[PDB]
Structure formats: C-alpha cells, structure tokens
Symmetry: C3
Subunit: 397 residues, 3 copies
C-alpha cells in the first residue's frame, strides 16, 4: 500500500491539514455539512481506542507483577506510588495557584466508601462491565500468587502455572500489535477530529475563554519545568538529555489524544535509553493509568472556573477538599479522549456544585468545547511524568 | 441406553408423532392441559440452543482466521462477503415481488449510527452481556494479530502465542461435542414444540393466514431454484449432485430449528464432498450467522403483511427502505428459534410502524403463531445458502 | 513480620478481645464511635470473601469433573446428591418441630420455572453478572466434554484439550493461595465484626429473642448428634474418631463465617484422614455450595418466627410449602456471611408474607441482628455435613 512514511510525520500532516480545512470552511455555510460527514469518521477512531484499553490494563499488569519477586516488588512499588501521589498533589495545588493569579471565567452572576470500593465484589463482573481500579487490584493479587506457585515443589501445579501465565502474556502481546494497527488509521481520524473542532470555534468569543486556556497552558508548562528539572537535578540526571529521548514520546502523545496507544512507543523509548527492563515493565503500565496529573491540574483549574462563574468563595477546607478529591478522581479516570470532563463532574459534585443547574451547565458547555484543545496538552504532560518517575527510581539503585 | 438409532430418523419420528397428538388432542378439552405439561419440556430445549451459540461464534472465528495467512484472507473474505450481501438483497426483493403478487393480509381497516455501533466500546462487556456483531469484529482482529505474532522472531512470545491459540481452539471443540449431546434431547423437544403448535392451530381460520403461508413458501422455493441453479450453472456445478450432499444438511436444518446445531453436520458434509478445509472452516461459521437470507425474505413479506393490515401504501423510497433495513436487521439477528420475529420488530419500527399500537399488534400476534411453522423453512434455506456460497468460491480457484 | 502464630489461635484471640471491648464500650457513649471507625475495617473483610467465591466455584468443578471418568461420575454423583437433598429435608423438618415445641416470637398482634432457570441462557453472562447454579451446570458439562476429547484419536485436538484444562486448573490453585492470604487478615476483621455486634446488643431485651436463639441452637446440636451418629453407626464409622479430625475444620468454620475459606482447610483434613482423592475433590466443592442445611433449618425456624409474629396459622400444605421452598432456596444461596437472610426473604415471599409490610419488617430487623450470632453455628454445621457425606460414600466402596 502507499502509506509508507513513518507514523509521527503522517499524524502531523493530518493535524495540520485538518486545522486549515476547519478554518476555511468555518467562514462559509459548509461549516454545517462537516458535522454530518466528518464526525462519523472521527468517532470511529475514538471507539477503537476504548476497545484496546481494557485488555492491556489487566494483562500487562499480571505479567509484570509475575516477573518480579515479591520483595523487590515491595521496594519499587512503595517508592513509585509515593512519588506518583506526591507529584499529583503538587500539580493540582500549582493549578490552584494559577487560577488564583489569573482569576478566570468571572462572567456574569462517602470519603471512606470510595476507598473501600477499590476491592472488587466480583472479579469477572467488575472486569467486564465495571471499573479500572478493581481490575488493577485483582491483577496484582493474581500475579503474586502465580509467583509463589512457580516456586512450589510439585511439578503438576508448576506446569499448570507456567501455562496459565503464558496464555495471559499472549493476550498482552496481541493487543500491542493491535495498537500499531490503530495508529495507521490515526492520521485520518485526527484530521477529522481537529477539523470539526476548528469549524465550531469562533475565535474572538473564544478569546475570553482563551484566558482560561492561557492559565491552563502556563500551569502545565510551569509544572514540567519546575518539578521535573528540580527532581532530576537533585537525583543527578542531565535534563536536556532526558528530554531528548522523551521528545519522541511527548510528540506522539501530543498529537494523539491517548495515554495508552503511547504506551508501546513509551516502552520502545525506555528500551532505547537503557533502563532495567522489569522495573519499567511493571512501573510504566501502572503509571499509564495512575499518572494523569496533567488532567488533575486541569480539573482543579476548571473547578475554580466553574466556581467563579457561579460566584462562590472557597474556604481553606473547601480548597483542601478540591485537592484530595482531585487526586482520587484522577486515579479513577480512564486513559482515553475526553474522559477528564466526565470525571470533572465527579469532583464538582463532591465540592457541592450540581451539574444539573442550567447556569453552571452553560458554563460547563463552554469549557467542554475547549476541552478538546486542552486534552492534547494533558496527554503530553502525562507521558512526561511516566518517563521521569521511572528514570528517577532506576537512578536510585 | 436404548436410544441407538441415527439422529435424523429419531427426530423425524418425534416430529410426526407430535403433530398427530397435537391434532387429536386439539378436538377435545385436553387441548388445554398440554400447555402446562408439554411446554416446559419444549422450552428446556430452546434454552439449551441459546447457551451453545455464543461460545461457538467467538471461538470458531478466532481459530479460523488464525489458520489462514492475511493475503489469502483478503481474497476469500471479499469474495464471500460480496456474495452474501448481494444474495440477501436478491432474496428480499424477490419476497417483495411475491407479496405484491399475492397481496396477503388485507383484512379490515441512525442509519450511520448502527454501522458505527459494530465496533465494540468494550470487548468483554459486549461479549458477555452484549451483541453478536461486535464479537465477530473483535474475534477477527485478534486472529490476525496472533498470526503476526506466530511469525515473530523471539521465541518467548512465539510460545506464548501458540499456547493462547490452543486454549481457544480447545473451547471450540468442546462446544461442538456439547452440540451432539443436545441433539440427543432434540427428538423429545421437537415432539413437544410441534405438539403445542398443532394444538393451538385452528385450521380453517388459519386458512386465511395460509395465503400468507403460501406466499412465503413459494418465495422460498423460488429462491432456491432460480438463484442457486443459475449461479451453479454459470460457474459449472451439477446442481442435483450438489443437492444430493446438501440434502442431509437441509433435512437436519428443516426438522431442527437451529442454524447453529446444524453447523457441525454441515462441516461433516463439507468434508465429505471434498473441499479445501481452511476455506470452509473460515467461511462457513461466518456464513452461519450472516447468511440468514431466508429470514430476510420472510421479514420483507411480513412487513408487507403488516402494512396491508394497517392499510398503508409504500413509495419507491419506502420499499428501498425496507430492503436496506432488512439486510442489516438480518445481519443483526441470532441463530436460534423464533428470533426472526424480534428482529422483524426492528425493521417495522424503522419503516415507521409502531409495535405498541393495538390493531397492528393483533395482526402481529396472528403472524407470531404461524412463525413457528415458517421457521423450519427459513432454516432449510439458510443452510442451503451456506453450502452453495462456499462451493462457488472454491470452484473459482 | 511478627504475626507468626498458627491461624486458628490468632482468630480465637481476636474474637475474644473483640467481644470484651464491645461489651465494655457498650456501657458508655463510645458505643457510638465504634460504628464509624470499626465497621469499615469489618466490611473490608466481607468483600474479600465474596471476591474469591466465584472463581473457586467454577474452576474447581471443571477440574474435578474432568479428572474422573463418566461412569464413576454417574455412581458417585447420584449417591451424593440423593444424600444431600434427603438430609436437607430432614434438617428443615427437625427445625419445624423445634419451632412448634418452643413456639418463639409470639409478640403482639413459578415452581417449575425456577427449576428450568438452572440452565443458563448465556454462559458468560450468567458467569460474570448472574448466579451460582448455572455456572455449576455449565462447568460440569464442560468437564465431561473435555474428558471425551482427551480420549480422542487426533493429536492436534488432544494437545489443545490438555492445555485448556491446565489453564483452568492454574486459576484454581491461585485462588486457593489467595484464600490463605485473606485468612491472615481474618483475625483483625473478626475482631471488628464481633465488636460491633456486641456493642449493639442490649442483653436483657435480647433475652426475649434469646428464646429464638435457644430454639435454633438446640435444633442444630440435635441435628449433628442424631442424624450424623445414626448414619455413621449404620455404615460403620467410629463417630468420636471422625469428629476428632472434623474438629479442626469445625472450629475454623465456627470462628470464621465463610463456608468457602474453610474449603482448603477441609481438603487438608480430607488428605489427613486418608480418603480417595478424586472422590473428595469432586464431592467436596459441590458440597460446599449445596450442603447449607444448617442455613435451611435456620430459615425454617425464622419463617415460623415471622409467621408467629404476624399471627398466622399454617396448614399441612403450607408447611410442606415451607419445606420444599427452603430446600431450593438453600441451594440458591451463596457461601458468604449474612446471605442466609437475603434468601430467607425468598422463602417468605414464597409462603406469601410480604417483606415490605412494616410490622413484619420490624420483626425481621430484630432477627437480622441476631443473625450475625446464628451465622457462626450455621457454618459449623455445614462443614460437618460436607465431611460426613464424603466419608459415608467412601465407606460404601
Ligand atoms: N484521556 C487522556 C487524558 C485525559 O484527558 O483525561 C489520556 O489519558 O490519554
Ligand atoms: N433462528 C433460525 C433463523 C430464524 O428463524 O431467524 C436459525 O438461525 O436457525
Ligand atoms: N454464609 C454462610 C452460610 C449462611 O449463613 O448462609 C456460609 O456459607 O459460610
């Protein structure tokens, strides 16, 4: 076939052309037709991303945890989890500071229960029709168990364990190649998605919301620079050299709006920059789904936007409430386009702002449009976080 | 045990005796009692057919697609799919012609969205509690992927892929033997089913609906003769010799009301008449669930019946609407007794006739009774279609 | 780590201390605080028990049935099933006799369809989000099939079958070690559970309900003694010697409120007392979920309690109705804490007493409290039943 260029170049070309077409059709009546024809081609991409998420989450964990002995798992797991949560908190507070400084959108005027829920009442049921988190719990559990079995004395169960582990590993590999296949469609789909967005955008009225956009972007960039360079220089990594390798991943994640299709590319990058394989094999897929701190910063800023549009004022307690809820709601989120808004609703209802009130609903719609733009940034920052965290831990050894 | 005859003979005997008993009890008060005692024995058969459908659909596809290299898959797949759809359209239009000629039942007076839906938003979720079509998509996908893995260079993933494929294949084989087991119950169950039908039937009032029945049967027989003999003689097969082998399958499918229990018998027939194994292994289970064109012709005729009972008149556009909708709704259907009526409702609501209106509901009930008779014919024609299509393609090589 | 004692000792210590703390805090205002802090630690145990139930039911059956040839399966299966049902009936009638004698709680004033339901309309769907019983049916089916395949002549399918069976067996083993892991948490959780119960209990008012409690306990103890000693002496087992081994299992089952975590300990006990392995491997996990006759006796007694609180009088027909319904509803039940009450509702609605009427609802709440106490007894008697039944059958050979 004739599509033979390398992937990222293809996607970039598609993005560019889609933006141009969206603008020039925006001026004229064709701005309507594009909805009917183009959007279907876009949605077909989105769905293909959701499909591949669920199998890669379960399987890849099970293999990863199985490969490592339990003690080493203890050490690496605690280090990494501590780092993940701390950085997420740092990110959302940085976002709140940005919101306070810019003050966007002024316009015109069970807390234990959720921590208990993480344990699956039923594994198959939660796996098929339920949530991400419980599958993570069950996967790690099963991996540890299979390890102990492989040490066992009796050959019968030893052979059984080996073959089970091999089956699950096979499922994982297959899903990765499926991802490559989807990326070939990705240029066409990206073209469609961005074209519809640009055609709906009216620039100068969007200019008011652009103050929101500026707050968000400045927050994201500040996070990258400040946090990751400070940490890398404390532990002793040359940041520009790290970013050199990261750049491929970050580009792929910026143009595509998946935190998950990026995963195999990320693992290639990890193999290139010479890291102990098992460590990244375990930590990276866990990170792909926990390290959505960019989405956390966004959620904080948007919570402040909606609050400012409603006109409320927040105590220290309510701002702490935002912070904690945002961490947990980010952990609950799933790695696919647009999802961050659906979880933003969770945190809003936590703080006490109803999604069904029409005034705030209108403001929310305004934000939902620009969410498509902000999504690209969020994804870039997420993959950055993954790579940095793994590199740090590996440097400690 | 004492049931030792060959299967088809057993089923035929059961059918005959059940019909006789239904008639002679129909004359007298016992016509009531049979509902309570006999129907339960019948339902227990129906359920056993549904159970075995879902696993054989998924598994058998995955193995089939895995066995064949991708290029050959391209060629055979496109040929077969084109043929399937074309013949389905031919069938439903033939049915509309029959309806126009006989004019039965006069009595007394998202289109893209569904094509998008075929992609599963979640594979496990759609597999367990969702539809047929998406499992087909995902199965084919997974098979292709496993093929590429088996070519891969690295032994670890090679062994993993092999073992996964073997597991799935094992599930398939087991389900086939389960089918044989169910067929042993089938004589008893067929006896029950047909007895209840005959006991409910009042012959002379059914005589008016018998004009509907005659239209349907004449349509089916005309389809067999005209379409399949024309095609076979174009490509160069002796039709009576083909039908000789087909006869076993067609009988088994006529007496039993499953398009799926017939599948193993069909594959035996394919092995007998000497066909390239991989080709039929892939094309036949796909055909078992797509080639329900007999049900398509029925759905067209019944749509015209309901329309004539409502008294409406149909433009060229609405008749085209019937045709297209019928193709897609047949593809959505599942291979078990009585299902065709449930999908008939889909096409009716598509054309714009509400199922909840009482007048048309009464007419629909009249048709639902005779649906049990017509089901047998539909199934015969379906298996005919499967065998013919595979034979044609194999003849082209 | 510092928790190094043997399990049962740990659990006993936890139970004791939790009871004491519950009482002494009960006197004072702290009786309130314990709800908030302690209950969460308790629930986290309960959920972990539910999780592990569903996988061990399916997998362990499939392996068991696969190991044994079909003929031997016929013999052992019929013997065991007959025994299970007969003893369940004996138990519930004994309970009704006890209820008549004590007359507790006087206070102040589809039957075929469910038997048909056992067959799964969809296997994956019933497995993930549906019930226990259909998974049992499908599991046994699949096991038999895999056996025949292993006899088959063709090596390809032979290898496939072997590998499938090995996968499923691996899942089983892993789940057993998970059970051990949960038991380490069990002491802490038991402490919490019992403490909350004791803190809610007001002793002297509970003294009236204690007449209910006495009826129940006397019934249970009478069942053990009379039934099992009569049977053991008929077939020729020294009862005290049997109970010697049983004692470990019965203690573990009394302190823990799971009929399922006890299963591996039970199988250890079976290996100790020298029984043919395959026989107990099949019969014991089937028994773990069918032999809940202690819960059956309780359900009968509680049905009479609620009836006496409503003030109704029961014919011979209605008492037979209770008996039959109780057998089936016990079979439907699942092996986890508190479940017996939820199925008690099924039998109540069967007899015709509505759960939504407030008077009987109040009485039901009174019983629901003490259900936590009675649960321990039920579980002890259940594991006794399992061991005795297997021992009897093995003695016949
Ligand atoms: N869906 C994005 C992040 C987000 O916007 O929530 C990803 O994980 O790839
Ligand atoms: N259920 C039939 C066809 C139909 O009547 O819809 C079959 O596929 O066997
Ligand atoms: N849930 C208990 C019995 C019951 O109380 O229903 C068990 O099976 O362990």
């Amino acid at each position: 076939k004739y599509i033979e260029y390398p992937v990222l170049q293809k996607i970039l070309i598609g993005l560019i052309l889609g933006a141009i077409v969206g603008l020039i059709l925006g001026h004229y009546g064709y701005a309507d037709a594009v909805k009917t024809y183009v959007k279907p081609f876009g949605d077909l991409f989105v769905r293909l991303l959701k499909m591949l998420v669920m199998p890669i989450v379960f399987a890849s964990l099970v293999v990863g945890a199985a490969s490592i002995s339990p003690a080493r798992l203890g050490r690496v797991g605690v280090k990494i989890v501590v780092y993940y949560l701390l950085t997420s908190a740092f990110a959302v507070t940085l976002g709140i500071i940005m919101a306070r400084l810019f003050n966007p959108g002024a316009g015109i005027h069970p807390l234990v229960k959720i921590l208990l829920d993480i344990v699956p009442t039923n594994p198959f049921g939660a796996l098929a029709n339920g949530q991400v988190c419980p599958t993570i719990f069950f996967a790690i559990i099963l991996g540890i168990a299979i390890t102990y079995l492989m040490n066992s004395e009796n050959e019968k169960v030893r052979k059984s364990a080996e073959t089970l582990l091999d089956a699950i590993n096979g499922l994982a590999e297959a899903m990765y190649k499926i991802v490559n296949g989807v990326m070939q469609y990705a240029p066409i789909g990206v073209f469609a998605l961005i074209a519809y967005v640009m055609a709906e955008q009216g620039v100068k009225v969007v200019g008011e919301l652009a103050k929101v956009t500026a707050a968000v972007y400045v927050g994201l960039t500040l996070q990258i620079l400040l946090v990751y360079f400070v940490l890398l220089k404390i532990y002793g990594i040359d940041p520009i050299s790290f970013i050199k390798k990261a750049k491929d991943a970050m580009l792929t994640a910026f143009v595509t709006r998946s935190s998950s299709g990026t995963l195999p590319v990320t693992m290639r990058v990890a193999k290139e920059m010479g890291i102990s394989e098992g460590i990244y094999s375990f930590t990276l897929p866990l990170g792909a789904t926990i390290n959505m701190d960019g989405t956390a910063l966004y959620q904080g800023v948007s919570t402040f936007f909606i609050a400012n549009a409603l006109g409320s004022h927040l105590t220290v307690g309510q701002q702490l409430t935002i912070v904690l809820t945002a961490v947990l709601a980010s952990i609950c989120t799933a790695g696919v386009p647009g999802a961050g808004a659906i979880m933003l609703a969770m945190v809003l209802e936590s703080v006490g702002l109803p999604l069904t009130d029409p005034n705030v609903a209108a403001a929310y719609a305004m934000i939902l449009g620009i969410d498509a733009i902000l999504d690209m940034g969020r994804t870039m920052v997420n993959v950055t976080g993954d790579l940095t965290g793994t590199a740090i831990v590996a440097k400690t050894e």
